[PDB]
Amino acid sequence: APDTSVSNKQNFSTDVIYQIFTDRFSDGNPANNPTGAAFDGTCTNLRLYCGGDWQGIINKINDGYLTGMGVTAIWISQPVENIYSIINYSGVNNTAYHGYWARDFKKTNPAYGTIADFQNLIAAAHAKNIKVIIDFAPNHTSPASSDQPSFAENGRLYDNGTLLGGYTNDTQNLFHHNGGTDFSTTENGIYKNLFDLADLNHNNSTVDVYLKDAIKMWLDLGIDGIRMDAVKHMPFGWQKSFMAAVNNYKPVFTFGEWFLGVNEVSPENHKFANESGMSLLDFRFAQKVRQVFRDNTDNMYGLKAMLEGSAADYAQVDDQVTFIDNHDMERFHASNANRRKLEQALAFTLTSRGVPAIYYGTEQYMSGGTDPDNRARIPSFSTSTTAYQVIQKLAPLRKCNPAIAYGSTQERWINNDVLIYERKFGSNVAVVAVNRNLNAPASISGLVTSLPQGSYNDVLGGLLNGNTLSVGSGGAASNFTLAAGGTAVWQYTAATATPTIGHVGPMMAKPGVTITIDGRGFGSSKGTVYFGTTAVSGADITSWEDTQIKVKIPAVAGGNYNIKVANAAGTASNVYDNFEVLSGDQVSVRFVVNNATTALGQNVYLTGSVSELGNWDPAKAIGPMYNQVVYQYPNWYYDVSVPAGKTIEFKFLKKQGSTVTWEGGSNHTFTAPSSGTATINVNWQP
Ligand SMILES: OC[C@H]1O[C@H](O[C@H]2[C@H](O)[C@@H](O)[C@@H](O)O[C@@H]2CO)[C@H](O)[C@@H](O)[C@@H]1O
Ligand SMILES: OC[C@H]1O[C@H](O[C@H]2[C@H](O)[C@@H](O)[C@@H](O)O[C@@H]2CO)[C@H](O)[C@@H](O)[C@@H]1O
Ligand SMILES: OC[C@H]1O[C@H](O[C@H]2[C@H](O)[C@@H](O)[C@@H](O)O[C@@H]2CO)[C@H](O)[C@@H](O)[C@@H]1O
Ligand SMILES: [Ca+2]
Numbered sequence: 231a232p233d234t235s236v237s238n239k240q241n242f243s244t245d246v247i248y249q250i251f252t253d254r255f256s257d258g259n260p261a262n263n264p265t266g267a268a269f270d271g272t273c274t275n276l277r278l279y280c281g282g283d284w285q286g287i288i289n290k291i292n293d294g295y296l297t298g299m300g301v302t303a304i305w306i307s308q309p310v311e312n313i314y315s316i317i318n319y320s321g322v323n324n325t326a327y328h329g330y331w332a333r334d335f336k337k338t339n340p341a342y343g344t345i346a347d348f349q350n351l352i353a354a355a356h357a358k359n360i361k362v363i364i365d366f367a368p369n370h371t372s373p374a375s376s377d378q379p380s381f382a383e384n385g386r387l388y389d390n391g392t393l394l395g396g397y398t399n400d401t402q403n404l405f406h407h408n409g410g411t412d413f414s415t416t417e418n419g420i421y422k423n424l425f426d427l428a429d430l431n432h433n434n435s436t437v438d439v440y441l442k443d444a445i446k447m448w449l450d451l452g453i454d455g456i457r458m459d460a461v462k463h464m465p466f467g468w469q470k471s472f473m474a475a476v477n478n479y480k481p482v483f484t485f486g487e488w489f490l491g492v493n494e495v496s497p498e499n500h501k502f503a504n505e506s507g508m509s510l511l512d513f514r515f516a517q518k519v520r521q522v523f524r525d526n527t528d529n530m531y532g533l534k535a536m537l538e539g540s541a542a543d544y545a546q547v548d549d550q551v552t553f554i555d556n557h558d559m560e561r562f563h564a565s566n567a568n569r570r571k572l573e574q575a576l577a578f579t580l581t582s583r584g585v586p587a588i589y590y591g592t593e594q595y596m597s598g599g600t601d602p603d604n605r606a607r608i609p610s611f612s613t614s615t616t617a618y619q620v621i622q623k624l625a626p627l628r629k630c631n632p633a634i635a636y637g638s639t640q641e642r643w644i645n646n647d648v649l650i651y652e653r654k655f656g657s658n659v660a661v662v663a664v665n666r667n668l669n670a671p672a673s674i675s676g677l678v679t680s681l682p683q684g685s686y687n688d689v690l691g692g693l694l695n696g697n698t699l700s701v702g703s704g705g706a707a708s709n710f711t712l713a714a715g716g717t718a719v720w721q722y723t724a725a726t727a728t729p730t731i732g733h734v735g736p737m738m739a740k741p742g743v744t745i746t747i748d749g750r751g752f753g754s755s756k757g758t759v760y761f762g763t764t765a766v767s768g769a770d771i772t773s774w775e776d777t778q779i780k781v782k783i784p785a786v787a788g789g790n791y792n793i794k795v796a797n798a799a800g801t802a803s804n805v806y807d808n809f810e811v812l813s814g815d816q817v818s819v820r821f822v823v824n825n826a827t828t829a830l831g832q833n834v835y836l837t838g839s840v841s842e843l844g845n846w847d848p849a850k851a852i853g854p855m856y857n858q859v860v861y862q863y864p865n866w867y868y869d870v871s872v873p874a875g876k877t878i879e880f881k882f883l884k885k886q887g888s889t890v891t892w893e894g895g896s897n898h899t900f901t902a903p904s905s906g907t908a909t910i911n912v913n914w915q916p
């Protein structure tokens with residue numbers, strides 16, 4: 231199939247995601263509605279169930295709401311069974327309507343539906359070319375109180391009906407008993423509880439294996455992708471071992487939530503996105519769009535900077551999921567604000583790099599503050615709004631104009647209020663003009679583009695006061711006026727003759743797994759695929775089309791590799807870098823080093839004999855290690871993904887800047903478990 235097909239679970243770059251709070255969308259089946267005090271059919275009390283379910287979703291899919299908008303993927307609430315208690319938080323009653331309070335990951339939330347309803351959801355969606363994504367929140371179970379076991383469900387965890395354990399009397403040590411996090415450090419926010427939610431302990435084999443098996447069930451149920459919750463609150467290595475579990479089984483596009491505030495830029499965040507095996511929700515993008523288009527606390531220069539910086543910081547920028555709002559922020563649209571702000575922000579997002587996500591109700595101009603105010607019931611299914619139409623005209627370009635789906639981004643004109651950028655990929659171009667100034671038009675002269683000579687109509691048809699563009703020789707546009715609040719899209723598409731790789735997924739897996747290479751100009755004849763210098767051709771290439779190639783990872787050593795393709799005539803493509811070949815299936819192992827004292831600004835790191843440990847390359851060592859919570863300085867620890875059942879040699883190092891100090895003696899050694907987790911405790915050798 232082509233890169234654009236509903237069946238492509240590895241690439242969402244050509245899609246438009248619609249984020250839905252199941253409960254708050256559409257109650258298509260009143261029979262599964264909770265009853266009594268857990269339910270409010272008026273949906274006036276935003277903390278209770280309103281009754282929205284899978285059936286309702288199916289209904290809106292079939293009646294043209296979503297399809298008419300141009301939406302091609304839906305992201306829904308965590309489908310697993312949640313706790314049934316009503317929690318009174320100081321007078322107020324709270325239900326698990328949101329789906330973040332898991333009790334059993336192997337069952338469904340009966341208020342959403344049955345497994346059968348789930349299967350129907352998948353079917354109907356797929357039938358309409360819509361991919362399905364689900365939320366998955368393995369960091370915890372539910373709100374618990376260790377000495378008030380009667381509170382809620384004591385964070386009880388069940389394995390398909392079987393009680394595994396509770397927060398009180400956790401002799402198995404299924405959970406963390408370190409208190410609550412103050413969000414003070416990253417380590418602090420991982421090994422302590424989030425609020426009162428029972429923190430799952432991923433270092434417990436039971437827990438480890440359980441979750442890895444649970445996700446497989448959903449995978450087998452046909453999902454298209456996963457949205458991981460609280461990735462910043464779980465161990466990095468564990469998560470990587472989790473991703474490996476998914477990828478080495480049935481890969482699907484996965485993205486996690488790592489909250490970023492205004493003006494916040496985190497290197498931990500970049501590294502995580504670049505190395506864990508998953509991508510992230512683009513908070514950096516969201517926050518910046520809001521400052522510029524919403525709160526006017528930054529200008530075009532700021533947007534520009536975010537665009538260029540993010541492209542340099544994320545190895546795969548096109549995999550970051552963009553948005554203007556979601557369940558954790560107040561609604562972009564403010565009661566009294568000018569609607570054109572929302573419309574422009576939408577237009578901007580839909581035509582920018584990454585994977586756009588639209589929070590349900592945006593198209594309806596919903597307003598609301600933070601939780602739960604931003605989780606109201608969609609007031610209507612009218613296609614008559616301007617926002618609905620904007621989406622409707624733009625979403626589809628992601629599928630038909632690869633410049634939008636995979637192109638580079640380049641500023642062509644700019645001022646405080648205006649931004650003109652160009653997207654480009656192969657013989658395809660898109661040019662977007664945005665004028666945030668709601669009161670002043672702008673005089674656009676000197677605009678140069680890659681568009682061929684001719685006249686271009688605004689793809690928005692003037693909907694946001696866009697105009698026509700006139701390109702002369704050299705791609706120079708003649709002068710024009712960009713209306714106040716003006717937004718225009720111009721484009722050019724043509725066949726690409728040379729092989730051009732636009733995307734690859736998954737980005738990390740063991741030899742033998744099939745990966746998907748998307749782009750253009752591959753031709754219809756099987757060519758060759760290179761992993762570094764290794765050539766792959768023939769049978770291992772399971773499928774070859776002009777826009778997509780499916781190939782099995784050869785059995786090469788674990789490491790990072792560049793991917794390139796050559797058509798049947800031998801013409802080579804551009805390189806796609808950062809592909810990770812695992813050394814095999816992975817397990818999560820905790821490394822502990824005793825008495826490794828350091829000087830200020832000096833941290834301990836881990837290295838070793840396998841690619842997963844950097845192959846003795848200090849520039850690729852794991853760390854810095856932690857030393858506050860689980861173990862205390864001068865003892866250090868860290869959770870790491872490693873090849874299962876392998877005998878590994880390793881050493882620790884003290885790094886300062888790029889200056890490194892090695893542990894003395896000889897390599898420590900160990901053999902990874904075959905499954906489950908393990909803990910290796912050693913002393914630092916001077
Ligand atoms: O002429 C090419 C030139 O175009 C753009 O520069 C704009 C600038 O952004 C506007 O603020 C205004 O000063 O007009 C200039 C064009 O005359 C690109 O920003 C620039 O890099 C490029 O060279
Ligand atoms: O919290 C981690 C912290 O650990 C390291 O610093 C050690 C320091 O080297 C010791 O002399 C001692 O005073 O304890 C510190 C840990 O609390 C790293 O030097 C530092 O960058 C890191 O944040
Ligand atoms: O470079 C590969 C090499 O790395 C490590 O050797 C360290 C050694 O442990 C240190 O004591 C110090 O001498 O630096 C060496 C780096 O050249 C591994 O121990 C070794 O097995 C591996 O071959
Ligand atoms: Ca219902």
Ligand SMILES: [Ca+2]
Pocket residue numbers: 369419420421422429430463464465
């Ligand atoms: Ca945690």
